Design a protein around this ligand. Structure first.
Ligand code: V2M
Ligand code: V2M
Lengths: 304, 303
């Protein structure tokens, strides 16, 4: 047993990380087949990033202005195009380590693994949750842009995040692999502020199902509730409202424990309104919200 | 900026994990060069695991009794030996993906990355610390035996742990790659307790420095303490004593923040006597002790 913040094995993503450089600006890129994906601001000088006109900055760039390196080995750029805030660079070599992959735009509350990369070399792996305000509580240093977030189902790597920005509050913002930012952020060198964050309700409920599975079930009450009533109450406590998809992904945990989702909602609502009464859940007085229902099942039944 | 429990990239280890089956028992193995290391209880049966005479059970085994699968290929075992609790399976093929590696014995309070594997296929990576009582608080299910813990220095993988056991308390026990258990544990099917679990003081202080580097300072105070007077209080709370080496290792963090180590100790002493009320540090409601000073320096340098 045991419950930990767990990342996916990073080997399949490691073989795809490369370094992209324009002039002196360097960051990370994702090499899949014969295309490298990286943040478009690599074409900016330090001064350009303050108020960049990317369309104009890109028209002054040719394939030969782009330095793409796998390690110290260069991959000649034979084509380039801009898709939203991501740059796509066609290279003359298909990545022999390209895994089965796809690009996905995740929802708030969903978790993914981040391969922290520097100069095209991953340095650490850790799991992140997309906060409801479209930030992630990551750990990123200078030169980390281009780091990607991913999940692995079966043998297919689903890329969902590429790093771009650190906010003044210390949290982080980025895009999907199609260059579309998560949240209302832009790739400018400007102090941008995210919206007020909230607790990921679906993940809190998954954490409660995790407790029940392990014999910690003192919090189960005899009431039930409607989805609408719970949402209205949940927002009064800074909790995100549940969707139909939330109820459905809680299905397996509901069937495994025999506790209907709306019953657990009624239990969680009582915890929100009355507190923990000096008690703990899974050895904690804090309600954990960065464990998705899939993380709970995967850690109560290790799948690979 | 930011601070997160973070493991090393697992690619180099993934290319080394294999599946080892003996009779009706399957677990993970580590394929380096022409040898596959795994827990020796894979040779045991249901009745053997209760009190196995491993030397007795091992000699009655043949190379063909061992099914070593590396993906869709089966490796031919051409030799079997035993080094303490680690069974060594010689194979006719050397692992092409063998990286630069060494076998090291981790010290208590030090951290390592764990590649949790099942049926020779890794499924998750997370960081652990070797607790003073020589257990680790991991996440392991049935079939996780053979999983390894490691660190990576440059291009060298330092293997330091192989998983064997989950104690009745939910914690986990294992060996180094020489088959020597961490702690007073034994690879038999018995319920085993560990010593009293003390807190890794130097790690808690590093983690306090990380909180300051990241904008958290509500726990600081104007007071200072001597090393001994802090250790008096710390030991009273089942905290490991702080040594001058620990003080020295914290230097970089103290310089970066401008907070003397003994000033942080005065803060920790207050936290231990008053508690945190309802407040949290770096999002946690407890004092985290599984971050080493090096972990903090690596994530907070320049921040
Ligand atoms: C390996 O997977 C075994 O091949 C591993 C799995 C454990 C159990 C689920 N999570 C893990 O980490 N180890 C064992 O099953 C181990 C086998 C050898 C004898 C060392 N035994 C235990 O972990 C074990 C035995 C007992 C026990 O007795 C019976 C009473 C309480 C707890 C306990 N754990
Ligand atoms: C990339 O590595 C640069 O390519 C970098 C990642 C950060 C470095 C430290 N931690 C990180 O996550 N990204 C940036 O530097 C971006 C670049 C934009 C998209 C052009 N900008 C910021 O992170 C940034 C700018 C400002 C700011 O202004 C100036 C004010 C406050 C915060 C802030 N962050």
């Amino acid at each position: 047993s045991g419950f930990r913040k767990m990342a996916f094995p990073s080997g399949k993503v490691e073989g795809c990380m490369v370094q992209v450089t324009c002039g002196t600006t360097t960051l990370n890129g994702l090499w899949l087949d014969d295309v490298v994906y990286c943040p478009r601001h690599v074409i900016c000088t330090s001064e350009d990033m303050l108020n960049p006109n990317y369309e104009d900055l890109l028209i002054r760039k040719s394939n030969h202005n782009f330095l793409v390196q796998a390690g110290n080995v260069q991959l000649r750029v034979i084509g380039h195009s801009m898709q939203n805030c991501v740059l796509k660079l066609k290279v003359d070599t298909a990545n022999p380590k390209t895994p089965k992959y796809k690009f996905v735009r995740i929802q708030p509350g969903q978790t993914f693994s981040v391969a922290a990369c520097y100069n095209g070399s991953p340095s650490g792996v850790y799991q992140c949750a997309m906060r409801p305000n479209f930030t992630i509580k990551g750990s990123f240093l200078n030169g980390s842009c281009g780091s990607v977030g991913f999940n692995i189902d079966y043998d297919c790597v689903s890329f969902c995040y590429m790093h771009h920005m650190e906010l003044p509050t210390g949290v982080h913002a980025g895009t999907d692999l199609e260059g579309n930012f998560y949240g209302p952020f832009v790739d400018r060198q400007t102090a941008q502020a995210a919206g007020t964050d909230t607790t990921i309700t679906v993940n809190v409920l998954a954490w409660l199902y995790a407790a029940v599975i392990n014999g910690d079930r003192w919090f189960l009450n005899r009431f039930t509730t409607t989805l609408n009533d719970f949402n209205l109450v949940a927002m009064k406590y800074n909790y995100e409202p549940l969707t139909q998809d939330h109820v459905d992904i809680l299905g397996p945990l509901s069937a495994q424990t025999g506790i209907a989702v709306l019953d657990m909602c009624a239990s969680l609502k009582e915890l929100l309104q009355n507190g923990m009464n000096g008690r703990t859940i899974l050895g904690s007085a804090l309600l954990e919200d960065e464990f998705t229902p899939f993380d709970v099942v995967r850690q109560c039944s290790g799948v690979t």
